[PDB]
């Protein structure tokens, strides 16, 4: 981090009409992906025409996968001749406060981490198009963190169904759905491998002891209601317990000196708990209001202070 | 015993100060200057035939 801040300068070209110049002044706080940390880039680098692979414009799922190789930045101010942003990964400003603007269909709360999501919603994929320059600027959607663990989990689970409903969500009671579209076979297999690595790596020999506690839980959900409404009506372990009576192995090789339950839990934290960072990107940002409210509304700015 | 080393001098450059009007290219310009240009959008010139 530098003392005097660090602000890249995305250049605006020469020939821009007045129906386009006032279309960029509504881009006051958005999320803009720089590919490097060059102080000088162009809009031809920012826009979706630079996002394309060789000629295949990818789906929403690959659009997740090519954010984690870029550097998300937030516009602070728009001159007539250049657009100024601040990369999130380097350093915010002197203040550590960069104002955003909610594109979300969902209002925020204080302290909640923001992981950004492509425009997956229906009636919502609103791309600011420049006509005199022939560009599309896809602006991604900042969402609260436990939403971003749902929507990424909805899309990866959907693509597995194609390899042989789901697209209904609920959050703060407002019913919202997501766009149904065919998913290309390429980037979905890059998700399935990133699962099964982190899925198998969480299986240590100590998990043969935890899997003999399943008959305790299915009897514990009979008495304490905390364990009833834990499992689910639509879970696996309930119908798993009604057919399987597991039992522990006899011994362990040199099992006296080592703790089998402890090694299964250390490996579970860094591999299976870490999984929400492998599929999506990292929650860089949370919302830390100074005076305003517990709730930041849609179409309104929000002060922002960084976060692990 | 007597020994020594030496520095027998050092040599520099001069930067060649170049006025633009000393070039032979300065006919193909009409040079009148703006004290402000960022305070300006599209500007226009009219010719008539």
């Amino acid at each position: 981090m530098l003392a005097d801040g660090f602000e890249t300068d995305i250049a605006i070209p020469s020939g821009i009409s007045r129906p386009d110049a006032a279309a960029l002044q509504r881009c006051e706080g958005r999320v803009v992906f720089l590919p490097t940390i060059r102080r000088q880039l162009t809009l031809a680098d920012v826009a979706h025409e630079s996002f394309v692979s060789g000629g295949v414009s990818p789906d929403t799922l690959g659009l997740l996968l090519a954010y984690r190789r870029r550097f998300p930045a937030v516009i602070t101010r728009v001159l007539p001749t250049r657009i100024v942003a601040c990369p999130l990964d380097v350093g915010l400003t002197h203040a550590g406060t960069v104002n955003l603007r909610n594109t979300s269909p969902v209002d925020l709360c204080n302290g909640d981490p923001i992981s950004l999501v492509p425009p997956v919603f229906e009636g919502q994929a609103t791309d600011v198009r420049l006509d005199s320059l022939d560009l599309t600027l896809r602006f991604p959607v900042p969402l609260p963190s436990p939403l971003a663990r749902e929507i990424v989990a909805r899309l990866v689970a959907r693509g597995i169904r194609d390899l042989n409903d789901l697209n209904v969500l609920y959050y703060n009671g407002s019913r919202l759905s997501l766009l149904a579209d065919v998913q290309q076979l390429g980037p979905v297999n890059a998700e399935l491998r990133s699962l099964v690595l982190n899925m198998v790596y969480s299986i240590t020999e100590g998990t043969t002891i935890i899997l003999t506690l399943i008959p305790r839980l299915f009897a514990l959900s009979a008495q304490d209601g905390y364990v009833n409404a834990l499992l689910q009506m639509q879970s696996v372990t309930r119908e798993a317990a009604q057919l399987i009576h597991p039992e522990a192995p006899a011994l362990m090789q040199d099992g006296e000196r080592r703790l089998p339950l402890y090694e299964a839990l250390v490996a579970w934290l860094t591999h299976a708990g870490q999984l929400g960072d492998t599929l999506a990107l990292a929650p860089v940002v949370r919302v830390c209001t100074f005076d305003g409210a517990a709730v930041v509304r849609s179409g309104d700015m929000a002060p922002v202070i960084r976060y692990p | 015993d007597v020994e020594f080393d030496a520095l027998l001098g050092s040599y520099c450059n001069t930067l060649s100060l170049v006025r633009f009007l000393e070039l032979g290219l300065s006919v193909a310009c009409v040079c009148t200057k703006f004290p402000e240009l960022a305070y300006m959008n599209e500007g226009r010139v009219q010719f008539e035939v």
């Binding site: - | 226009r44 010139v45 009219q46 010719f47 008539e48 035939v49």
Partner: protein, 43 residues
């Protein structure tokens, strides 16, 4: 494509030196008007 201002003509800045067929090349200019002799929208 704005209609320019006809009184800037009325005291001109600097005069040309050579007349050419002008509508042969148009896209060097933006608001181009072939006025067959003195016509409607000049006023």
């Amino acid at each position: 494509p704005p209609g320019y201002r006809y009184a800037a003509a009325m005291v001109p800045t600097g005069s040309l030196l050579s007349t050419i067929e002008v509508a042969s090349h148009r896209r060097l200019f933006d608001f181009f008007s072939r006025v067959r002799s003195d016509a409607n929208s000049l006023y």
